[PDB]
C-alpha cells in the first residue's frame, strides 16, 4: 500500500490471519480450570498444543452439499482423578472453526457470507458541556469502557458531582471513591480544589466514608436503590463487581491509552483496569473545564472512534463459545461424579458449543451478511462497508465522502477509502508523502497517519507547477491543517496527498471525468453500477479510469495462475498448466447461478504453449474482458428530444440492440422442494399423480422429476409430489419459462428412520432488452426504455449510421452531470481510432481545461485520420448535424453524438374524500375491520354498540356487530 | 376480443395522486401513461362507475384547488 493500490480484500485477509495467529490463544487461555464441589476431579486444557486441521472437504464441495467450510480445533486435555491419582491426557476435539477464503468470504451451510466492519465509540474520557433549560452551561465527562460501559460524571447546579450510572441512579463522588480504597485525606490533598470537595461533606456522609467497608454498603444502597441496610459479605462484592466493575471499569489497552493521553497521566500501558486516580483525575479536569481551561471533545472525530473487524467479532464468538463449553463440562462433570463413573475427557466435551455458536453468529448477527454476487463489483465492495450522518474532516482518505446509503440509513453505512488501512488501535490510517528536510535518512517517505496525527500536519493537495521572479518554496497552495483550509507557502508544507484515488471508494473511483459531475450524481452512480447485470457477451469500456483492472483482480471472478509454467490444454471445462515438473488442472465455472440469479461463466484467456507467471490471468469471468471489469456496452448515442418518447428519463432505442443481442443476459433460477413426514405418512415423489392431465406431466421422468434439457412453461410440473393423497407438486410460477440446465437430488443423511429428500431444478432464461427495462451510464444518468424503433426510423449520422439510443438532453443541466458529455465524445474518438483511454480523475491538476483539451484533440485526430469531418466540427466541437430517419431532412441544430458505456440494470382516502366519491371509497374499504375492533375492545371490558334511530317512528335498532 | 369489449367504457383508478382513466389494451408488458402523469382499481358497482367517469376524470379537474391554477401546463420538451 506504500507504492501500489492495496488488494481490496486486504483488511479481511489480515484480520483473519490475526484471529488464527493470535486471537485463538487469547481466548483459549481465558478458559477457567473446572473443579467440582468436592474438588476430587479437576479438568484442564493444555493450550500450548492447540491444533487446527485442514478441512476434509473443498470449498466447491461445501457449496454443492450445503455444508460449512471449516477447520477442526484440537487441544490436549488432562483429567486427574484424585481417587486413583491417574492423569489421563487425550487429544480433545473442541469443535469446528469456519475458515475464510482469500476473497474474505465464509461458506456457512452453503451460503457465502461476509462480515462487515463496525465503527464504534472508542473507550476513554470525553468532556462535553450541554446547556440546561435556563441556558446555563453544565459540563459533563464520561468514561467509556472496552465493553461500552458508561460511568458518567456531571456538574450539577449546586456543584455536587454525581456518578450517573443510569437515568434514575445517582451516586456521589466521595462515596464511590472511598469504596475503592481511597481515604478522605488523600483525595483533598491531590485535587486542585479541595475546598470545593469539603464544601459538600454532610455529617452523615463523613461517618460512612471513614471506613472502606461502610462506603461499599453506602455505594450499594445508591447503586441498587433497594430500601434497607445491606450487610457486607463476599458474595455482595462478587455480584457488585460483575454488574458494575466488570462491565464499566475495564478500560482495556485502547481505553488506558486514551485515558492516559487525554488526562496527561504517566500510568503504565499494561494496566487495563480503572484506577482511583483516573476517576479522581476526571473530577479535576471537569472543574477546570468549567472555568475555561482546555477544549471540549468532538465525538464525531475518527480519533475518538475505533473499527471492529472480522478479527474482533470472530474472537468474541470464540470467547462466548468457550464460556458455554465450561458450563457444558461443569454439568457433565457433576453427572459422572453422581454416578461414580470415570469420565473420558472426550465424553465431557461436545462439539456443539463451538459449531452451533458460529452457525448462529453467521445466521443471526446483523454484521454477517449474504454476499451480493450480482456482478464482480458487488462482490468486492460488500466487504469494505462500514456500519455505524455528516462528513467530518477526519474522514478524508479513510471514509469516502460520497458512497453512502439512500433512505433512512444515509450517513450510517459508508465505505472505506481505496488506500485506507486499519491500524494498531482499531484506527483507520491513510498514506501521505512526507516532505523531509535536508538532513535525514528517510528511507520510505510514504507514511500512514491515524486521525489523531492528521490535524497537526500541514497537508497539501496542490502541485509545484508555479514560478515567478521569487523562488519556488514561496509559492502558495491550499492545504489542510487543524480541520480547516489555509493557503500557505510550499516550505511550510509537511505532507503531500499524491495518490489519485486516495479520497474515494471503489464505486466513485470508476466514474471517468468525475470532477465534472455534481457530487450527488456520483453517489447515485455508485448504486447503479452495483445493479448492473452481467451480459452474455462482455465488452470493455472505451473510456475508463484505470481502476477496472484492480476490481477484476481482487474480485476473484477470473482465474489466475497459482504457479508459473506453460499451458498444455484448454477447453470449455478446464485448463491444464504445467511448470517445474508439476501439472495442475484448473476447472472452469460454467453457467453457474449466483445469489441474485445472475449467470457466472468462465472462458479461457490463454492458448496452448503460452508461458504464464504466477498471478497472471488464465480465464475471464462474467462481466470481465481481458482482466478488466466490463459491466456494459459502448453504443452510438444522440442527445436530443424525440417526439416525447424520451420525456424525462425515458430512453428511445433501436431494434438493432434487440436482434444484435447487445444487451442480452442469462438468468438462472433455482426451484427447490423438500419431503417431510406428516402425521399421516411420508410425502412421496412419483410421476403418477391422479387427476392431472398428461400434457402437464410430459416433462417428468419415471421418478417424477423434470427431464434435463426440457423446455418448461408456466404451470408445467417440475417435481411430482404427493402428500398423504393430495397433490403438492413443484409447479413453475408465472413468468418462468426457460430451459432446465441442471437437476439435483439427494437425501440428507440424518439419524432418523426417514431422511428428507431435496430436489433442485435450475432453469436458464435468455433475456433480451425490452420496453420497461432500465439502463444507466456511469454518471448517474439512469433511464427507462420506452420505445424500440426500426433502424430506418432512427436519426442517423453524416456517415449514414443510425444511432442506437436517443437520450433527453434536458436531463443534463438539471442534474449537473457534465461528465457524461466528455465521455460520449471521447468514446466516439476511441472507437474510430481503435483506442481505449484510462484516465485518472482530476486531470485539471495538470492544467486548466485538461479534459476539454484531451477530448477535443482526440476528436480532431479521429476526424483527420479517418477522413470523417463531421466527427470534429470547428464551428461546434463535439456536435454534428444529423438526419431524421423518417423524412431524410436534417435536424435544425447540431446534436452531440457519441459512444458512451451504457449498463443494463436488474392520503389516498383523503384524495377520494376531496373528490366526494363516497361510493368508490366504500368499495375500496370493503365490516371485518370494525367487528374485529369490537372484540378487542371487549377484551378491555368496554362495549361498543351501534344504534340506528329511525327517523320515521323513532325506534332504536341495535345493529348486529 | 371479449376483453376489449368489456374494457370499453369501464374506467379504472390509477394510484391528483389518484385519478380515473379510460383503459385501452396495448402491446407489451408495461403500463403506458400520458406524459402529464402501482395500484389499479376497477370500480364494480354502477354507483362507483358513475363517480369515476363523472367526478375523477382528468378533464373536469383542470384547475388546482389551492389558488385555481391550471394543472396540466406543458413542461420540459413540450
Amino acid at each position: 500500500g506504500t507504492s501500489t493500490i492495496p488488494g481490496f480484500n486486504q483488511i479481511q485477509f489480515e484480520g483473519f490471519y490475526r484471529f488464527i495467529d493470535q486471537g485463538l490463544i487469547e481466548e483459549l487461555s481465558k478458559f477457567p480450570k473446572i473443579e467440582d464441589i468436592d474438588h476430587e476431579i479437576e479438568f484442564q486444557l493444555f493450550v500450548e498444543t492447540y491444533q487446527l486441521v485442514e478441512p476434509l472437504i473443498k470449498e466447491r464441495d461445501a457449496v454443492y452439499e450445503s455444508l460449512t467450510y471449516s477447520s477442526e480445533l484440537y487441544v490436549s486435555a488432562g483429567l486427574i482423578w484424585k481417587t486413583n491419582r491417574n492423569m489421563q491426557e487425550q487429544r480433545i476435539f473442541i469443535g469446528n472453526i469456519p475458515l475464510m477464503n482469500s476473497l474474505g468470504t465464509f461458506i456457512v451451510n452453503g451460503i457465502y457470507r461476509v462480515v462487515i466492519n463496525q465503527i464504534l465509540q472508542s473507550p476513554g474520557i470525553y468532556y462535553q458541556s450541554e446547556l440546561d433549560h435556563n441556558g446555563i452551561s453544565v459540563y459533563t465527562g464520561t468514561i467509556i469502557s472496552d465493553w461500552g460501559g458508561r460511568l458518567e460524571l456531571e456538574i450539577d447546579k449546586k456543584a455536587r458531582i454525581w456518578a450517573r450510572v443510569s437515568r434514575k441512579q445517582k451516586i456521589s463522588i466521595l462515596v464511590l471513591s472511598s469504596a475503592m480504597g481511597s481515604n478522605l485525606r488523600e483525595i483533598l490533598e491531590n485535587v486542585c480544589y479541595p475546598e470545593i470537595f469539603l464544601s459538600f461533606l454532610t455529617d452523615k456522609e463523613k461517618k460512612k466514608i471513614g471506613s472502606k467497608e461502610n462506603a461499599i454498603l453506602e455505594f450499594y444502597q445508591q447503586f441498587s436503590c433497594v430500601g434497607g441496610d445491606p450487610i457486607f459479605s463476599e458474595s455482595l462484592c462478587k455480584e457488585l463487581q460483575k454488574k458494575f466493575f466488570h462491565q464499566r471499569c475495564e478500560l482495556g489497552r485502547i481505553g488506558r491509552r486514551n485515558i492516559n493521553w487525554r488526562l496527561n497521566l504517566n500510568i503504565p500501558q499494561n494496566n487495563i483496569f480503572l484506577l482511583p486516580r483516573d476517576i479522581l483525575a476526571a473530577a479535576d479536569h471537569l472543574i477546570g473545564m468549567k472555568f475555561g481551561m482546555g477544549t471540549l471533545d468532538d465525538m464525531n472525530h475518527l480519533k475518538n472512534k475505533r473499527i471492529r473487524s472480522v478479527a474482533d467479532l470472530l474472537q468474541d464468538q470464540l470467547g462466548l463459545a468457550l464460556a458455554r463449553l465450561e458450563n457444558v463440562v461443569k454439568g457433565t462433570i457433576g453427572g459422572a461424579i453422581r454416578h461414580k463413573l470415570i469420565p473420558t475427557p472426550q465424553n465431557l466435551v461436545t462439539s456443539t458449543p463451538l459449531t452451533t455458536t458460529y452457525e448462529s453468529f453467521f445466521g443471526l448477527h446483523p454484521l454477517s451478511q449474504v454476499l451480493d454476487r450480482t456482478n464482480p463489483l458487488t462482490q468486492i465492495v460488500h466487504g469494505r462497508k462500514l456500519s455505524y450522518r455528516d462528513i467530518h474532516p477526519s474522514h478524508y482518505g479513510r471514509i469516502c465522502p460520497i458512497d453512502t446509503s439512500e433512505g433512512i440509513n444515509v450517513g450510517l453505512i459508508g465505505s472505506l477509502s481505496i488506500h485506507a488501512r486499519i491500524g494498531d488501535w482499531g484506527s483507520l490510517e491513510s498514506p501521505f508523502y512526507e516532505l523531509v528536510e535536508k538532513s535525514k535518512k528517510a528511507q520510505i517517505r510514504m507514511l500512514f497517519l491515524s486521525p489523531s496525527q492528521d490535524e497537526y500536519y500541514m497537508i497539501a493537495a496542490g502541485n509545484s507547477l508555479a514560478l515567478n521572479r521569487g523562488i519556488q518554496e514561496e509559492q502558495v497552495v491550499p492545504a489542510r491543517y487543524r480541520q480547516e483550509f489555509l493557503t500557505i507557502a510550499w516550505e511550510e508544507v509537511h505532507l503531500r496527498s499524491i495518490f489519485p484515488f486516495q479520497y474515494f471508494s471503489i464505486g466513485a473511483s470508476l466514474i471517468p471525468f468525475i470532477e465534472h459531475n455534481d457530487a450527488n450524481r456520483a453517489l447515485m452512480s455508485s448504486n447503479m453500477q452495483r445493479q448492473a447485470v452481467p451480459l452474455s457477451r462482455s465488452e470493455k469500456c472505451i473510456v475508463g479510469t484505470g481502476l477496472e483492472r484492480q476490481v477484476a483482480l481482487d474480485s476473484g471472478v477470473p482465474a489466475i495462475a497459482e504457479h508459473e509454467g506453460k499451458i498444455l490444454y484448454t477447453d470449455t471445462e478446464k485448463i491444464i498448466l504445467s511448470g517445474n515438473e508439476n501439472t495442475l488442472s484448473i476447472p472452469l465455472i460454467m453457467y453457474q447461478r449466483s445469489n441474485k440469479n445472475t449467470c457466472m461463466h468462465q472462458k479461457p484467456q490463454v492458448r496452448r504453449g503460452k508461458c504464464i507467471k504466477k498471478g497472471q490471468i488464465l480465464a475471464d469471468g462474467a462481466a470481465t474482458v481481458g482482466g478488466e471489469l466490463a459491466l456494459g456496452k459502448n453504443v452510438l448515442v444522440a442527445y436530443m428530444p424525440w417526439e416525447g418518447y424520451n420525456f424525462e428519463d425515458a430512453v428511445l432505442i433501436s431494434e438493432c440492440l434487440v436482434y444484435g443481442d447487445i444487451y442480452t443476459s442469462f438468468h438462472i433460477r433455482k426451484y427447490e422442494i423438500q419431503t417431510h413426514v406428516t402425521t399421516q405418512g411420508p410425502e412421496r415423489i412419483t410421476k403418477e399423480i391422479p387427476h392431472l392431465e398428461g400434457r402437464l406431466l410430459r416433462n417428468l421422468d419415471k421418478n417424477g422429476i423434470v427431464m434435463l434439457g426440457s423446455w418448461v412453461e408456466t404451470g408445467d410440473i417440475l417435481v411430482g409430489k404427493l402428500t398423504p393423497s393430495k397433490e403438492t407438486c413443484l409447479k413453475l410460477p408465472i413468468g418462468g419459462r426457460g430451459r432446465v440446465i441442471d437437476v439435483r437430488w439427494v437425501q440428507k443423511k440424518g439419524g432418523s428412520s426417514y431422511n428428507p429428500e431435496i430436489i433442485r431444478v435450475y432453469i436458464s432464461q435468455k433475456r433480451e432488452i425490452k420496453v420497461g427495462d432500465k439502463v444507466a451510464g456511469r454518471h448517474g444518468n439512469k433511464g427507462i426504455i420506452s420505445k424500440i424503433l426500426p433502424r430506418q426510423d432512427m436519426p442517423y449520422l453524416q456517415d449514414g449510421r443510425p444511432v442506437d439510443m436517443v437520450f433527453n438532453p434536458l436531463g443534463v443541466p438539471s442534474r449537473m452531470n457534465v461528465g457524461q458529455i466528455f465521455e460520449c465524445s471521447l468514446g466516439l474518438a476511441g472507437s474510430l481510432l481503435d483506442r481505449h483511454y484510462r484516465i485518472a480523475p482530476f486531470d485539471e491538476r495538470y492544467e486548466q481545461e485538461a479534459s476539454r483539451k484531451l477530448v477535443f484533440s482526440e476528436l480532431y485526430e479521429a476526424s483527420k485520420q479517418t477522413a470523417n469531418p463531421w466527427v470534429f466540427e470547428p464551428e461546434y466541437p463535439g456536435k454534428s448535424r444529423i438526419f431524421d430517419g423518417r423524412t431524410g431532412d436534417p435536424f435544425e441544430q447540431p446534436v452531440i453524438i457519441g459512444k458512451p458505456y451504457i449498463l443494463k440494470l436488474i392520503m389516498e382516502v383523503w384524495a377520494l374524500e376531496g373528490f366526494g366519491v363516497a361510493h368508490i371509497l366504500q368499495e375500496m374499504l370493503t365490516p371485518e375491520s370494525f367487528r374485529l375492533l369490537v372484540r378487542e375492545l371487549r377484551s378491555l371490558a368496554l362495549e361498543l354498540n351501534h344504534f340506528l334511530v329511525s327517523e320515521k317512528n323513532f325506534q332504536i335498532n341495535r345493529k348486529e356487530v | 376480443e371479449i376483453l376489449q369489449e368489456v374494457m370499453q367504457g369501464h374506467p379504472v383508478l390509477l394510484n391528483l395522486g389518484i385519478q380515473s382513466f379510460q383503459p385501452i389494451l396495448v402491446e407489451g408488458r408495461t403500463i403506458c401513461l400520458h406524459p402529464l402523469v402501482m395500484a389499479v382499481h376497477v370500480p364494480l358497482s354502477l354507483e362507483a362507475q358513475a363517480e369515476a367517469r363523472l367526478l375523477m376524470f382528468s378533464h373536469m379537474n383542470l384547475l388546482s384547488p389551492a389558488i385555481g391554477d391550471p394543472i396540466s401546463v406543458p413542461t420540459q420538451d413540450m
Binding site: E643, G644, Y645, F647, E648, A650, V771, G772, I784, I785, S786, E936, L937, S939, L940 | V26, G28, T30, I31, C32, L33, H34, P35, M38
Partner: peptide
C-alpha cells in the same frame, strides 16, 4: 408499573393497550 414483564428471549410483552395503539410514457 415500571420495568414491564419480559419473556425469556428479552422481549417486553405486548398488552391490549399496545394492540389498540412499471410505468412507461406514451406521448400519443
Amino acid at each position: 408499573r415500571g420495568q414491564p414483564m419480559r419473556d425469556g428471549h428479552n422481549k417486553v410483552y405486548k398488552s391490549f393497550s399496545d394492540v389498540i395503539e412499471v410505468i412507461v410514457v406514451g406521448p400519443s
